[PDB]
Amino acid sequence: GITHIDYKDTELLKRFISERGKILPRRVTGTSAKYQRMLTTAIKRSRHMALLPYVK
Amino acid sequence: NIENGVAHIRSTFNNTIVTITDEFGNALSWSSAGALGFKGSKKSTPFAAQMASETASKSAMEHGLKTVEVTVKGPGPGRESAIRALQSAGLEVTAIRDVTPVPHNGCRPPKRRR
Amino acid sequence: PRKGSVPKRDVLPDPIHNSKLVTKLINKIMLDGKRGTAQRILYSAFDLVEQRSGRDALEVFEEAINNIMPVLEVKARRVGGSNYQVPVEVRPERRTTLGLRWLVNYARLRGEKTMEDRLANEILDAANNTGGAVKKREDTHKMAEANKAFAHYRW
RNA sequence: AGUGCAGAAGAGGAAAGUGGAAUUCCAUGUGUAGCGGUGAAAUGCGCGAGAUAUGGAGGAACACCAGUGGCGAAGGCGACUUUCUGGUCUGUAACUGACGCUGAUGUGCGAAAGCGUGGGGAUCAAACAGGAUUAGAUACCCUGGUAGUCCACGCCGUAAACGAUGAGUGCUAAGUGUUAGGGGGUGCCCCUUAGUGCUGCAGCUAACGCAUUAAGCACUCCGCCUGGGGAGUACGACCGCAAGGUUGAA
């Protein structure tokens, strides 16, 4: 549905994101498996820099 | 005992460490299940922790703590009797952090009784 | 007894004393089923108590029950996973019907020779506290007045 | 058919650890009566450990995109800053005009441990130091405790390789979950040139199960099997760093 999102973005990954800094399961979501895989992947290219926490 | 307190309470299934402190580690007061006589499966139990915080708040006699902004870490069933009963002078359990022991599967586990 | 819910099944009637608790204890003290004998012990032995003991057992019968009846009981009732007893709420048929036998098991206690006068000596040093009849009530009632247990049980 | 192939997948594989579960260590921002221990306690850190984390880099794993998904012949399998790498082929096949099937020669190679560098402790786990037991414990129980737990180099192979399924030719309802990727196409209907797991027509096997995507019926090889043990014990022949194998009448 959306176009690409990459490690430029780290909060366009907040739609599907938790409160600890992780993301919700794809089974509870349910959209373009391919598009959502890379989109969520980039946020993990960002847990590299870890802009989103692990615990507070 | 500086006119306020901060609750760094703890409860492993044994030795429910009720610990109302100040912000730094300046050692206000502590408590226990091993402080009021209970051993026989009344250690972490709601009917054995009715007065588990007054071995702290009235063995203070000068503070009467007034808030928490708590970090309820080291969780058990003794948690609840260590919070709701932390309101016996005005100690005002106010805020929480949702940060208990949540390690990340990097540890190695102790053993399992069948 | 698959069911239960059984009452006292009796309309407690009294002779010439005008009471509903002086007829439910006449059969308890009734030595070897002796109606008149206990009837004469509740109209001549329970009326001359003041002459021997000190006070009469007419309107002071409430002080020989209310000032001795305990509350917390001691009945095994497994709950959760351990083995701790739980007290039952002192109900009228479970506190006044069982807490009125303080004259049959205490009649053979007073060591004042005359057993008849010893049975009338159960009103003295027992109507208040620290007596020979409330000595077994302080070793039961006072055992769970501070140590609370399960409150979400069945009994 | 194979190389052309859009390339494209999934934990197919090789990617240092910048950062983080950073650990039982402790003066500690902080201090002492507890980090903590249990069928039954001593175990056990306090004559100046503590509670969680202020410097907290590190021994290290991606912890969270992580699903049963799917690369590959079984053993597998997880961010990547990505160092590289094939085939697989999903659509028809451009070239050549049989472009050959099970495959004892060879080679062989394949689970933690058993194996090779010294690192060898983050220190848990073997032994167990040790409590304790209903009539009955060195014990699954219990803090801690010396291989190992942190491995880039010699070669391997026993396991429920319980996958107990060996591989050529199609197959008598196809739908179905659907797979990156697609024959007609254009969050709208799909068929195998396809792939999986199947409820299961239909028909066989042996009581059972397979099923348009077959143990059934038809051409196949290394073959084993043809009532039980005992039997791998006399003995044994040849590989071999090692567990060892791998043989073999009674």
TrEMBL record, chain A:
The keyword Protein transport does not apply. The keyword Ribosomal protein applies. It comes from the Bacteria. GO terms for molecular function: small ribosomal subunit rRNA binding; structural constituent of ribosome. GO terms for biological process: translation. Keywords: Ribonucleoprotein, Ribosomal protein, RNA-binding, rRNA-binding. One of its GO terms (cellular component) is cytosolic small ribosomal subunit. Binds as a heterodimer with protein bS6 to the central domain of the 16S rRNA, where it helps stabilize the platform of the 30S subunit. Belongs to the bacterial ribosomal protein bS18 family. Part of the 30S ribosomal subunit. Forms a tight heterodimer with protein bS6. This is Small ribosomal subunit protein bS18. It comes from Staphylococcus schweitzeri. The gene is rpsR. The chain holds residues 22 to 77 of 80 of the full protein.
From TrEMBL, chain B:
PANTHER family: 40S RIBOSOMAL PROTEIN S14/30S RIBOSOMAL PROTEIN S11 (PTHR11759). It comes from Staphylococcus schweitzeri. GO terms for cellular component: ribonucleoprotein complex; ribosome. NCBIfam families: PRK05309.1 (NF003698), uS11_bact (TIGR03632). HAMAP family: Ribosomal_uS11. GO terms for biological process: translation. InterPro entries: Ribosomal_uS11 (IPR001971), Ribosomal_uS11_bac-type (IPR019981), Ribosomal_uS11_CS (IPR018102), Ribosomal_uS11_sf (IPR036967). Belongs to the universal ribosomal protein uS11 family. Pfam families: Ribosomal_S11. SUPFAM superfamilies: Translational machinery components. Part of the 30S ribosomal subunit. Interacts with proteins S7 and S18. Binds to IF-3. This is Small ribosomal subunit protein uS11. One of its GO terms (molecular function) is structural constituent of ribosome. It comes from the Bacteria. Keywords: Ribonucleoprotein, Ribosomal protein, RNA-binding, rRNA-binding.
From TrEMBL, chain C:
Keywords: Ribonucleoprotein, Ribosomal protein, RNA-binding, rRNA-binding, tRNA-binding. The gene is rpsG. Coiled coil: none annotated. GO terms for biological process: translation. PROSITE patterns: RIBOSOMAL_S7. One of the primary rRNA binding proteins, it binds directly to 16S rRNA where it nucleates assembly of the head domain of the 30S subunit. Is located at the subunit interface close to the decoding center, probably blocks exit of the E-site tRNA. This is Small ribosomal subunit protein uS7. Part of the 30S ribosomal subunit. Contacts proteins S9 and S11. Belongs to the universal ribosomal protein uS7 family. NCBIfam families: rpsG_bact. Residues 1-148 form the Small ribosomal subunit protein uS7 domain. GO terms for cellular component: small ribosomal subunit. CDD domains: uS7_Bacteria (cd14869). GO terms for molecular function: rRNA binding; structural constituent of ribosome; tRNA binding. It comes from the Bacteria. It holds the Pfam family Ribosomal_S7. InterPro entries: Ribosomal_uS7, Ribosomal_uS7_bac/org-type, Ribosomal_uS7_CS, Ribosomal_uS7_dom, Ribosomal_uS7_dom_sf.
